[PDB]
């Protein structure tokens with residue numbers, strides 16, 4: 001019901017190319033039962049360096065477009081911030097957005113980022129009074145099968161996010177993400193996940209799987225847990241409330 005990680009702004013990153021694509025992506029998200037989407041387009045040194053004024057501009061146009069989808073679809077502003085050290089000054093001085101202007105910022109790393117680097121970056125952001133929500137923790141080799149490390153990040157004041165796509169069963173044929181599904185399944189079993197979110201980009205390779213994932217978590221982990229990960233926690237994040 002509340003999706004805190006999405007790529008829905010046209011012509012700013014690897015998401016929609018056009019207004020028409022953004023609308024179609026919103027529509028599919030709405031169809032699946034999502035009622036609030038936080039826009040978190042990429043901020044990444046050397047990869048996604050679209051200027052902030054453009055991202056904000058196209059964002060506001062997507063927010064308008066969302067009215068054509070449904071009147072109760074709320075679009076919030078945010079950023080998926082790949083960590084490089086310049087990001088610290090940007091956050092301190094609010095030149096890079098948090099999630100709906102809350103304390104929470106969405107932070108990502110590389111698949112092969114060493115734990116010590118992860119731990120260090122997140123420690124420094126915490127020192128800014130900003131709470132990291134760690135994007136797609138199933139991506140990071142450093143956390144694979146590592147309850148102790150994830151726990152250590154959570155215990156110092158981080159929250160964790162897993163992509164809906166990796167919540168799904170590994171497919172009998174054509175499975176290209178088996179290792180990330182196994183990782184997400186590990187974290188869920190260990191009860192190490194605060195949030196499941198879309199990371200949606202398009203309707204081909206990367207659609208939302210929020211309805212499918214919600215049902216799967218309901219079946220395997222109970223409805224209350226599904227509510228927690230897909231509604232209650234995301235809602236606290238959007239409303240700048242402590243979890």
Ligand SMILES: [Fe+3]
Pocket residue numbers: 080108135136
């Ligand atoms: Fe990412």
Ligand SMILES: [Fe+3]
Pocket residue numbers: 005006007080199
């Ligand atoms: Fe993303």
